[PDB]
Amino acid sequence: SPTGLAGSLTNALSNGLLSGGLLGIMENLPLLDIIDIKVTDPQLLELGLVQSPDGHRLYVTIPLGIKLQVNTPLVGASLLRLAVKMDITAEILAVRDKQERIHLVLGDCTHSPGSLQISLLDGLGPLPIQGLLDSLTGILNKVLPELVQGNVCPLVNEVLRGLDITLVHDIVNMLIHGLQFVI
Amino acid sequence: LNVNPALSPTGLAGSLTNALSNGLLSGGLLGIMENLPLLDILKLGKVTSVIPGLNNVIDIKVTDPQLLELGLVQSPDGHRLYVTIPLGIKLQVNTPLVGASLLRLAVKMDITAEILAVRDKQERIHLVLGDCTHSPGSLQISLLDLPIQGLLDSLTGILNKVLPELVQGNVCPLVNEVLRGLDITLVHDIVNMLIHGLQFVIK
Fold first, then answer.
1. Which CATH code is given to the segment(s) B1-203?
2. Which fold has domain A1-183?
3. Rounded to a whole number, what is the distance in Å from the CA of B186 to chain A's nearest CA?
């Protein structure tokens, strides 16, 4: 069933991202370039939306989920799977272009400051290699947010350029006159 | 660079029509149309004659109902919103005169109804039906398939005078129900556009 502007956006983006091979982009992240690491189980979550108290500005949060597996010769970690959660926030801007068609684009697309969450799969124990994991978690937290937002943001931008013309104009018209439509 | 009201997530207007379109079909409007009691218009010499002389008709069968693409128009100021519901109906009329047997009529009509943004005694806002009325010059009857031109002349007259009030009387409650059962955010966003008079319907 059709919904308001808010809900219609998140539904449009989700489908757009998924169709853009978003999950496919995740499974091709080169970490070996920076043992062995294979990327699996990508999943896109419920997008979020927030609107400035003025109603003039609109931000979107894109939560992702992913599972990578590592092959270490260590004893407890012969095979290991980690589950890591990631969030991306970005501002959406109204832009007149071409013959004045007003398409939406990304503004400040950066990784959400403190929102990296890692855990162990298959019910393994941390203590057996709690000193080893410290090596990874430190590395990932300093190489993932840059790698992710460097591959996702160009996709999110291209998706916004393919939104429904009437969806855009309505949202913009709301933003301009500062009308809250998000709940 | 030209609009044509004929034939996924999208704007407010397009969401509204699709909401009403799917809301009427699951009404089920298409069933209501096909079961209109047109035979009641016809239903010892005083008990036999029935006002204008359409007495000969034996039976009136309603077939092939269809819903066309709903249309939307917004006030030039942008505070008022009207919807046109284009309907369709075939008609089969039975006479005992050999040879006629069957008259096939094709009727098309529109229902233009105002969508208001009213508020109740809880100060909360609803989308409520307003002037639901038959679109005056929308009624159009077609002959489709010898002295019939005297009966046809009488039939169309009654159809023109009854079908609107009949259809409108059966459709208006339906659409009024759907509007009150719309998505909450859909309603809210639409109202807000109207309050501030912002064109969200394409023209």
1. 3.15.10.10
2. Bactericidal permeability-increasing protein; domain 1 (3.15.10)
3. 4
Exposed, middle or buried, A63 (CB in 10 Å: 0-12/13-18/19+)?
Answer: middle
Nearest CA-CA partner of B189 in A54, A20, A55, A11: A55
Chain A residue nearest residue B14, CA to CA: A166
Q: Say what the resolution is, in angstroms.
A: 3.2
Method: X-ray
Beta bridge partners of B110: B86
Determine the Cα–Cα distance for residues B126 and B116; give it in Å rounded to an integer.
8
User: Which residues from B are below 8 Å from A166, CB to CB?
Assistant: 10-14, 200, 202
